[PDB]
Design a protein that fits this description.
This is part of a larger assembly, with chains A and B. Chain A is about 45% helix and about 0% strand. By secondary structure, chain A is mainly α. Chain B contains one helix and no strands. The chains are: A mainly alpha, B mainly alpha.
Chain lengths: ~55, ~70
């Protein structure tokens, strides 16, 4: 979504969680933080919905 | 003839949406917990000391009752 954006992903701001131990716990933390970042993106999308055809 | 109507955000925007981690501290110090534990232990020790001394006296009393009844 960052390096090769598609649709309007280059118009929303979010962070990318990064691990350091390469284990299950770090991936759990990354998934939880990705849920939080998805909430952030959802807020930005809700405030930026344009009119027009579908 | 009427205005175009569509599902749109309200004028202005939407209220801010919280997303960040919220884990409050909500705890006592270590010294306080340890002190409470030690005080509870000391209180229990003193109470049980008195109770067991009284129990020893009672045991001696009934042992003496036995000794009197033995002949």
């Amino acid at each position: 979504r960052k390096t090769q954006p598609y649709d309007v992903y280059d118009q929303v701001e979010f962070d990318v969680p990064i691990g350091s131990r390469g284990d299950c716990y770090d991936r759990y933390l990354c998934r939880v933080e990705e849920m939080r970042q998805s909430l952030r993106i959802i807020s930005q999308c809700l405030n930026k919905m344009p009119p027009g055809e579908i | 003839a009427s205005k175009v109507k569509q599902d749109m955000p309200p004028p202005g925007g939407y209220g801010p949406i919280d997303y960040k981690r919220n884990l409050p501290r909500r705890g006592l110090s270590g010294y306080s917990m340890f002190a409470v534990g030690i005080g509870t232990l000391l209180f229990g020790y003193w109470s049980m000391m008195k109770w067991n001394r009284e129990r020893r006296r009672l045991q001696i009393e009934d042992f003496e009752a036995r000794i009197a009844l033995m002949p």
